[PDB]
């Protein structure tokens, strides 16, 4: 359901965030 390309983008926050 194209629920990929914007899921990348977001798990780019959880490194940053995951720390």
Known sequence: ???L???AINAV???AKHN
Do not use: G
């Open 5 to 7: 390309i914007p899921h």
């Open 13 to 15: 926050s959880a490194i």
């Open 1 to 3: 359901f194209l629920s």
